Structure 1
Amino acid sequence: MFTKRHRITLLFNANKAYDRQVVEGVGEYLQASQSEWDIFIEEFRWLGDGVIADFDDKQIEQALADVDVPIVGVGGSYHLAESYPPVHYIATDNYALVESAFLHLKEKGVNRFAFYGLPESSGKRWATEREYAFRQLVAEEKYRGVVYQGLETAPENWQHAQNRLADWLQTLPPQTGIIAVTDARARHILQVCEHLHIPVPEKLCVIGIDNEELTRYLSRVALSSVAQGARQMGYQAAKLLHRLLDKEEMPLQRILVPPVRVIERRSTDYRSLTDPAVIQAMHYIRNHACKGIKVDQVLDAVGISRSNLEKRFKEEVGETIHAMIHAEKLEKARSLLISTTLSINEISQMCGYPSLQYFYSVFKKAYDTTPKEYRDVNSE
């Protein structure tokens, strides 16, 4: 009878989405097969009938290398085969990731790139493989690529890093594409740049991998990012693992999951703007948009009186004060709908808008629909 219980345990964590995506994806292959699997989640650190784990962490790859029950390890690829642990390694393709955002920058505009990696002193080792991934693709362009090695995930001198890494930020040429190992590290940037008042994406561009939806939610700037194939990755692991239970003999398998898409956000909203009095001029429009902005400020904000400020912006991106105080005040509203569970009349208030109609009326004038039509529409 259909009840061959296969008590399988999964070794991951819910901290990073990259993990929360993999296990959920196992639950994906679980429907397609309706197998009678007894799936457990026990791990800090008996075992069970079968396993699945995050082998990027050597800690679990070296201890479990004694049992032989069906184990399918997940993690990050290695262009260098011999750098692979003992077990069928179904992983994501580091290089496919880095190069994934890279093109994204070049697709929008960018011609100067820098990589914000990570100290070889952090347990993690994919950091590194994302560094060679970067190198190989940059050496084809014109402008070389600068690389930085931040601090511990969260060092003692929490504050020191905040200033040590910053120096680097000013050391790069303007309009750069700063790629970060993870959305975790690219955070450091979006926050320091917010401190050193370093317009983004105007002066520099930020971009990460993990795209984890928890962090990127909270900050002034939305962190544009790549989208690993984590779901698909943890879905493959369960299918291949099922093929290890029917006992297939197999040469250590190593398939590579291709990153999905690349969700685009503010952190990269580049528009090849090259005019100084227009640069800050813009970043400004953005920050204070839904705060109801006038001229006087706009002027000394880029640091240019009325005339000397007018004579300028008027030439480069074509869009009156009103033309841009609107779109950046609409975006701020479009964002507070699709990816931000809230209200519809509360958003018209904290976004500078008189009545509902005065909010709805101006919407259709741009999009052929309305708020309620859009709210659930492209929501996430």
Structure 2
Amino acid sequence: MFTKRHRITLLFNANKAYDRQVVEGVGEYLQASQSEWDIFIEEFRWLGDGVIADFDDKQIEQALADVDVPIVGVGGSYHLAESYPPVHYIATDNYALVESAFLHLKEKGVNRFAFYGLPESSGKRWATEREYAFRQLVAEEKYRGVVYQGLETAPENWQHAQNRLADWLQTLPPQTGIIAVTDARARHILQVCEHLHIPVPEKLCVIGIDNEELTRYLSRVALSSVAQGARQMGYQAAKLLHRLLDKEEMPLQRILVPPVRVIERRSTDYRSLTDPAVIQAMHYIRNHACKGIKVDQVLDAVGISRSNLEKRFKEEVGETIHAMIHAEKLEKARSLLISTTLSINEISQMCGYPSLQYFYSVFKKAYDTTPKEYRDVNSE
């Protein structure tokens, strides 16, 4: 008779992708265990028989400090072991996350490293934790790392904040890889580069930390990111809380979960390019190839004569401008198949192809499957 029910309270934020992942793991546990739990996503802030909560929040910790019922905290890791709150704790491995992104940029020949973080001013201790890790694994590189804490998440002066970020960005030499604390901060870099037409990744490379597509700002350049092991975190949390509900004795748990993987998108697609003019020209093309652009537009974007730009393209890419314009139409098309929900007809049309048959033809030449086949094998 499975009659005893437990009310379970989850203190997270439905509006942030990471929080949503954690709760989904909790839900996964519910499914796998078929527990007689009544789980409430109760966060705004009665309390149940067990709690799982966001402990990246000092307020929550203070609210919960002295609560009798089992609590499993979920939040960021800490280099110092005595900085962990007095509760069982599932942790995202802050070090590993930065490491994961560092190793990604490392593999792409990048040896100039930059970090866009978050002021001490915010209460974000995982930010400090990530910055420290950055410094730790950047220590032995050819050129030194450079760190720039921001102004604040919701600036008291957006315009001013933008100016300061713009200033810092123009400071950074070509082929600098930037690690942002959060996809949100990464997108902040991308919008400024948009304002300024700074080539990403042709000039500077950008990588984030959440794998969240919905941040304050949406970015035309798709954002590479470290995906946290957030589902697994929520699952392990519930699994532990279950043992805590069976009155099991235990020293306070500190289990670290590493990132799942890096999702490689456009923003880190660096191909060893170095000539400033090809850099700006290649960026231009990667923005507007689908819009049916001629070599003339590319020439006008940089301020260069046809002869000279062709010479340099040949020099650095072994292909023509015209050829690269069209190779990129394909790339846009290939991405959308992979990262989007559009019909193939829509992809063809939005990518400036004359007919869906023509795209089919061109696509089947470059890769060997069909647009359709390639989608099933490679989607998301």
TM-score norm. by structure 2 comes to: 0.96
Distance 1:208 1:243 in 2: 35
* Residue 3 (structure 1) shift: 3.1
2:351 is equivalent to residue 351 of structure 1: yes
The answer on whether the counterparts of 1:202 and 1:270 sit within 8 Å (CA) in structure 2 is yes
Query: What does the per-residue CA deviation read over 1:106-159, in whole Å, with 9 as the maximum and x for residues that have no partner?
Result: 101211001001101112211101011111100121211111111221122121
Q: Which shifted more, 214-223 or 319-328?
A: 214-223
Identity of aligned residues (%): 100
Q: Point out where structure 1 has 5 or more consecutive residues left out of the alignment.
A: none
Pairs aligned (count): 380
Query: What does the per-residue CA deviation read over 1:11-43, in whole Å, with 9 as the maximum and x for residues that have no partner?
Result: 111221110000001111222211111111112
The answer on whether the counterparts of 1:216 and 1:222 sit within 8 Å (CA) in structure 2 is no
Distance 2:164 2:235 in 1: 41
2:303 is equivalent to residue 336 of structure 1: no
Query: What does the per-residue CA deviation read over 1:291-338, in whole Å, with 9 as the maximum and x for residues that have no partner?
Result: 122222222323210111111110112222343222211121122233
The answer on whether the counterparts of 2:188 and 2:217 sit within 8 Å (CA) in structure 1 is no
* Residue 75 (structure 1) shift: 0.4
Structure 2 equivalent of residue 311 of structure 1: 311
Structure 1 equivalent of residue 166 of structure 2: 166
C-alpha distance 321-379 of structure 1, shift in aligned 2 (>3 A)? same
Distance 1:16 1:156 in 2: 22
* Residue 379 (structure 1) shift: 2.5
Query: What does the per-residue CA deviation read over 1:46-80, in whole Å, with 9 as the maximum and x for residues that have no partner?
Result: 20111100000111011111112111100000010
C-alpha distance 126-47 of structure 1, shift in aligned 2 (>3 A)? same
Q: Which has the higher strand share?
A: 2
Secondary structure of the 2:178 match is strand
Q: Which shifted more, 70-79 or 309-318?
A: 309-318
Q: Point out where structure 2 has 5 or more consecutive residues left out of the alignment.
A: none
* Residue 361 (structure 1) shift: 1.1
Secondary structure of the 1:215 match is coil
The answer on whether the counterparts of 1:11 and 1:43 sit within 8 Å (CA) in structure 2 is yes
* Residue 238 (structure 1) shift: 0.8
Distance 1:119 1:217 in 2: 19
Q: Which shifted more, 86-95 or 333-342?
A: 333-342
The answer on whether the counterparts of 1:8 and 1:38 sit within 8 Å (CA) in structure 2 is yes
Structure 1 ranges of 4+ moved more than 6 A: none
Distance 2:230 2:81 in 1: 21
Secondary structure of the 2:210 match is coil
Distance 2:45 2:31 in 1: 29
Secondary structure of the 1:100 match is helix
Secondary structure of the 1:38 match is strand
Output the aligned Cα RMSD: 1.5
C-alpha distance 19-180 of structure 1, shift in aligned 2 (>3 A)? same
Distance 1:49 1:335 in 2: 47
C-alpha distance 239-18 of structure 1, shift in aligned 2 (>3 A)? same
The answer on whether the counterparts of 1:338 and 1:376 sit within 8 Å (CA) in structure 2 is no
The answer on whether the counterparts of 1:9 and 1:42 sit within 8 Å (CA) in structure 2 is yes
Q: Which shifted more, 287-296 or 54-63?
A: 287-296
The answer on whether the counterparts of 1:88 and 1:254 sit within 8 Å (CA) in structure 2 is yes
Secondary structure of the 2:183 match is coil
* Residue 346 (structure 1) shift: 2.1
Q: Which shifted more, 229-238 or 360-369?
A: 360-369
* Residue 216 (structure 1) shift: 9.2
* Residue 192 (structure 1) shift: 0.2
Distance 1:214 1:322 in 2: 35
Q: Which shifted more, 272-281 or 83-92?
A: 272-281
TM-score norm. by structure 1 comes to: 0.96
Structure 2 equivalent of residue 88 of structure 1: 88
Distance 2:294 2:82 in 1: 62
C-alpha distance 324-3 of structure 1, shift in aligned 2 (>3 A)? farther
* Residue 376 (structure 1) shift: 4.5
The answer on whether the counterparts of 1:174 and 1:204 sit within 8 Å (CA) in structure 2 is yes
Q: Which shifted more, 166-175 or 50-59?
A: 166-175
Q: Which shifted more, 218-227 or 182-191?
A: 218-227
* Residue 366 (structure 1) shift: 1.8
* Residue 188 (structure 1) shift: 0.7
The answer on whether the counterparts of 2:310 and 2:320 sit within 8 Å (CA) in structure 1 is no
The answer on whether the counterparts of 2:187 and 2:218 sit within 8 Å (CA) in structure 1 is no
Distance 1:73 1:35 in 2: 20
C-alpha distance 130-104 of structure 1, shift in aligned 2 (>3 A)? same
Distance 2:105 2:3 in 1: 51
